[PDB]
Structure formats: C-alpha cells, structure tokens
Design a protein around this ligand. Structure first.
Ligand SMILES: *Cc1c(COP(=O)(O)O)cnc(C)c1O
Ligand SMILES: *Cc1c(COP(=O)(O)O)cnc(C)c1O
Lengths: 379, 389
C-alpha cells in the first residue's frame, strides 16, 4: 500500500472525498439552473478526474490545447470543445482528429480566422463545427457583445462558407478579480445576457446558433438564473484553491488538492521551517497576493489535512519552501514544533498552476491508500 | 541516401514547429557556456554547473565538453537521470531528507559518486546511523549560510559547525567539504554590490572550512556560487569550485541584475498570434502562463517585462512590446508603456510567429517536456528535459 507516509515528497495529493463533494456541488447547481455542465479539463488534464465529472452527469468537455483533445479522445471522450481562438496552422491537427471520429469543436472571434477554417474545410471535405467567442466583460478574446456587425460577418463567413455554426460562448474570467456575492451575481448576469444577446442577433439574421455556452467557476456558482443558456463551462471547482476561497466561492476546507512536503531543515533565529515543496512544486502563482488574504506560496495543513491558520509558505526557491508565521513573528523554537522529517500538506494559490508542475496526482482514498493518476504536460 | 531523404522531409524549423515551443539558440548557449568556463579557468577553480535550469542531458553534455567538473542537481530524480546518462560526479545540493537515504544509497551502490549536504546535527546523525547500518561511508558537505538567503549553518557558528562535522567524521562518514549559495544576489543590480556580495560569500564559506580544519576535521572542498556572484567575484582564494546554472541560458531577471544583455538570452518561447482587441492595442498569442510560467521576477526590478519581452521570429527584440497579461493558454501582447498601439493587427498579423524572452529561464523551461535546439542552419532538434521528482 502507498500512503501519505510512504510517498516521496513533494507530491500532488487529491483528497477524493473533497473532490467528489466539489463535483456533486457543481453538477447539482447546474441541474438546479436547467443547463448542461461541460467541465473544463485544463485544471487537471487527468482521465480519471474527468471520468468522475462525467459519472456525476457532465456532458462533454472543454480543453485548452489540442494535446488535451488527443489525450481525452484516445480515452473515449468524443464531445470536445477546444476553447482557445483557433490558429489556422493547427487546422491539419484539428482535421485529423475529426476524421478519426472526435466531435472536435473550434472557436473564433475574427472574420480572418473564420475564412481560414471555412476555406480549408471546403478543400478537405470537412464541415468544421465552429462557435463564435463573445467578449462579455473585457477580459480576453471575443467579439464585443454589442459588436453586431462583426458577429454577423463571422456568422455568415462560417454558415455561407459551408461550415457548421454551432453556437456562441463566453468566459467572464474577470470574475477572478471579484470578492462579494453581489458583484459575482451581477457579472454572471452580464455574462449570461451578453451571450444570449449574441445568439438572438445570429438567429434574427437567419443564422443557426443552437448552443449558448457561458462560464467561469465563480460565475457558475454565483448566477441567480441562466435563461437562454444551454451549458456552463467550469474547471477549477473540481479541486478549488485559495484564490477561489478569497473570491468567496469555497472555504479552505473544500480545497481537494494539496502538496505533500517534508520538513528538511530550519532557520531557528527567523522561525523558519524549510520544506521540500518550493516553487517547482507549488508553481510561481501568487494570485492571493492581490486579494484580501495573502497566503504566500500556500496555506500549511498538517498530514491529516487540518488547516493550520497563521502558518504559510512565506517564501519559495526552486526546491525549497520557507514555512513561517503569516503574522511576521519568528516562531520561537520552530524545530520543536516541526522536527526534521515531519510531513505537511500545502494548499495551492491556483490549482491548475500547481497541478501542472506534477506528472501525476496521488488520489487519496478513505482508507489512507493512494492510487497514481497521471496527467498531461506540454503541447 | 534513404535515411538522408526521409530525415530532410521530417526536419522542423521555427516555421513548422507547433507553438508554443521552448527554443534554445545554440550559438548563444555555447557563448554562455564558454564565457562561464573561461572565467572559472582564469580563477583556477572548477566549474560545477547546476543542471536544475535545463534538466537536459545534451545541455549538460555541452557544459562537460567545455571543461566542467561534475554537476550539481536539485533533486534525486536529476541525479538518477544524469547518472544513467554517464555523469558520475553529482552533488545533490538540497538539505538531505532522511527518508531519501535508501535512494541515495542505491545511486552510490550503482557507481554514482553522489555527494549529499546537511546543515543540522539531526540530519548528520540520520545519515551517519544509516551509513553505519548499511556499510556506506556517505560523502556529506556542510551547507553554510553566508548571506541570510535560505539553508545553512552560520559561517561564524563554530560550535554548530564542529558539532555537525564531528557527528559525520566520528560517525564514519566522509566529511567532504563546505558549500554556500549566495542567492540574495538576485536582489542586486550594480556591479559594486555584486562584487561585495561575491566576496562575502567566498569569505564566509572559506571561514567555515578554516574553522573545521582548525578542529582537525577534513574539509577538502570549498564550493560557492550563484550565477550573479560567479560572474562578479574578483578573487576566489580558498575556493575549489563554483556552482552556477541559470547562466547557460540567461533570462530577463539576469539582464536586469546586470550580468548579461537581452541578446545573451538563449531561451525564448516561440508563439503564434491568434487574435486581437484592436481598440485596446492587444495582440493575443498562444503563449500564456502555462508556456511562460507564472514567474514575474522582473516586476520588482528596474524594468518590468510583464510575462516576457517580445522579439520577432529572427529573435531580435521588439522594443516596447511585452506580454502585459497572461492567462493559462493566452498571452496578451501590448505596449509596456501602457499606450494602445494603433493598428495592432497590422503590427502583429494573425498567424505571425514571435519569440518571447522569459523572466526566469528555469521556471519557463520547466513548463516544457523538451526544448527545440536551434542550429545556425535554422534546423531544430528535440532535446528532452526532466519533469517532476
Ligand atoms: C478555463 C476556462 C473555463 C473554466 O473556468 P474556470 O474559472 O477556470 O473554472 C471556461 N471557459 C474558458 C474559455 C476557459 O478558458
Ligand atoms: C540553483 C543553485 C545554484 C546555481 O545558481 P544560479 O543563480 O541558479 O545559477 C548554486 N547552488 C545552489 C545550492 C543552487 O540551488
């Protein structure tokens, strides 16, 4: 039996009970709202994590790279949305996946990218399914929600060009800057309204738009109503993290991903315990620094997963993390509290960034045993 | 010529690779390798490169061919990979955890001349007890704290030096030396401050070695270094070797510290423009923080490069454009000075390929399974690197 006492450190540990609670909470909310859940696997890139999301009721997946679409298709998942503005040079890759039987959907937000897809699709005999990305909050990519002329020009380029105009999507990722239920509820409504308005504008122009897809984890969990929406995309919620805790959509005790670390030394005068989880284990993500509670490079928990308020990783080098008091004081006799060899678990600022540092997760069962769940690295 | 014809037809260049990709400019890397080795040769000290920046066999092979002596690793997985590749002289330069002793023993039993470090009496007792139990005289160095950065015994803490040194020597282990790493050098940016810190690091490590020797304890190696202090030390009297790693590529944090120029940076991320927000002057690229890493070490330095400095396809800097924001798989390219470029779509057309210089070469490299090693002829070769532990 591998267990938390036998693993080498650092290790990325998924508490499966916490993961299952998070999976149930999101699926039950999307059912309450009358929409499908299309989880975004870029958080975990792991076949068994996505399998648990599908078993609870999810419908298809969202991926952030074509490498994830290859991985998940090779595992039997065919309903795949690649939710990053399509690069024309990746069209041969996308064509090969569709010819193989993957129902791979692409997105675009410009006439030039829509023309490149439709021209290549006609040449190769492929009616690509393409969704139009809508910018509903100024966060990133997308056609402005009131830019009707651009929306229609892209829609007619796809539809008149022989492609399948499959829907519109938006991602209100500016939700990550918010931290009150009122602000999140309001942004969720702006995301819903803007995505529904773009669908209605396509329809009113006689163009097909069967899918309306919205979501980020915080807006998924905050939306009061989702009229007009057919699916919500969310991914980080499967594990949560401290940035999500600060946004206010979970508690620290809901975070299912932690990094198992061993105490390898101390600086007694400074009240530091040095652990073997540095920034190569945690990642350089410091999202909580700009939030109302800064957790440094992570929140310390004991080996049982009990949060230890007031101890965080105040600093990190590549393979060394510095555990110390959040209150700035030099904990007296730090080595007496955390002897050499003590194992601790660190909750991450950002679950997708920390998970991508590891070749695999250690999925922790109720009996204390672990099973290794590989995940994807690279492109 | 069957092999020849098939090989050509399969050769990648910067035009055919998928993006993002981590590209090493081999000519720049070789200048970096030569420069550090020449400096250590001129000081009469060994260079023991730290492979944690690249974790790539052919990069360490270039360092060894240039004259390096052994390597430094940050994990036992690195020691396993490089020993399998034929590197026998390996220093594991992270405070040794007792639970890793069986793996260290197996590596030594297979022929790896693996050196461990400690900075505590309890760690030295654990190594000596296991070495007695297993019939192994481990070689252990004592880590010295010469600048307040991280691990190590204070250079002037004689009683703790001797306690640890005697625990190892009386315990039947080989007390092989002292080492220090003056990582506070990353907060400096003037040659005055760097030269003075390099002198503090040399003086403190040598002080500890002299105190052990004055107690009758062996201490034949004195090992110092960070890339900034390796490049700044005036003198290395009393030092046997210098360890440096990031110099093999450099990055924008090193450029800001002042120990290289942006044109010495050998690692860049190849990216494609996939979109725009013309009214905000944004080009959107397919290198987000998953490609660049979340490192923002330049944010506190004299020039903030956001998530990386934009260069053209030929690798030349495009002044004033940086990645100002990054999400997982999207980077936001825009003016450093916060003006909205007019006509951003004509400046950076959809499908244009760019190269992004990183804040931190070790952090960006770790995001990739492999580097694309770019030769003078524009040909690339895939150079695998290690991920995980
Ligand atoms: C990552 C992502 C999501 C899921 O949002 P999270 O807040 O990461 O759960 C949805 N849509 C798109 C386009 C994304 O990139
Ligand atoms: C990384 C490291 C080095 C090399 O320093 P760079 O500034 O990273 O070149 C040397 N010694 C130790 C102990 C290190 O961790």
């Amino acid at each position: 039996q591998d267990t938390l006492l036998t693993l080498d450190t650092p290790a990325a540990v998924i508490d499966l009970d916490r993961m299952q609670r998070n999976i149930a909470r999101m699926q039950q909310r999307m059912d309450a709202q009358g929409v499908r859940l299309r989880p975004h696997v870029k958080t975990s890139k792991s076949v068994p994590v996505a399998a648990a999301q599908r078993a609870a009721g999810a419908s298809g997946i969202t991926v952030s790279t074509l490498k994830e679409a290859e991985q998940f298709f090779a595992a039997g998942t065919t309903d795949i949305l690649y939710a990053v503005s399509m690069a024309p040079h990746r069209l041969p890759q996308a064509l090969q996946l569709r010819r193989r039987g993957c129902d791979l959907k692409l997105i675009v937000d410009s006439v030039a990218a829509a023309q490149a897809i439709a021209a290549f699709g006609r040449e190769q005999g492929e009616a690509f399914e393409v969704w139009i990305e809508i910018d509903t909050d100024g966060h990133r990519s997308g056609v402005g929600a009131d830019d009707t002329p651009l929306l229609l020009a892209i829609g007619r380029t796809l539809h008149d060009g022989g492609m399948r105009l499959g829907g519109v999507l938006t991602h209100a990722g500016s939700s990550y800057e918010l931290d009150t239920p009122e602000a999140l509820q309001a942004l969720a409504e702006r995301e819903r309204a803007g995505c529904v308005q773009a669908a209605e504008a396509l329809r009113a122009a006689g163009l097909p738009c069967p899918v309306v897809s919205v979501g980020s984890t915080p807006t998924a969990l905050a939306a009061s109503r989702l009229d007009g929406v057919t699916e919500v995309r969310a991914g980080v919620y499967v594990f949560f993290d401290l940035v999500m805790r600060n946004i206010g959509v979970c508690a620290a005790e809901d975070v299912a991903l932690s990094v198992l670390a061993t105490v390898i030394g101390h600086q007694a005068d400074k009240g530091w315990a040095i652990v073997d989880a540095g920034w190569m284990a945690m990642s350089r993500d410091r999202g909580t620094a700009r939030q109302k509670q800064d957790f440094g490079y992570g929140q310390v928990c004991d080996l049982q997963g009990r949060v230890m308020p007031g101890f965080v990783l105040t600093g990190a080098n590549q393979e060394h993390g510095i555990l110390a008091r959040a209150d700035g004081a030099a904990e007296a006799d730090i080595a007496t509290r955390f002897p050499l060899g003590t194992r601790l678990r660190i909750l991450p600022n950002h679950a997708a960034a920390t998970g991508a540092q590891f070749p695999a997760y250690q999925a922790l069962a109720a009996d204390g045993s672990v099973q290794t769940w590989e995940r994807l690295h690279g492109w």
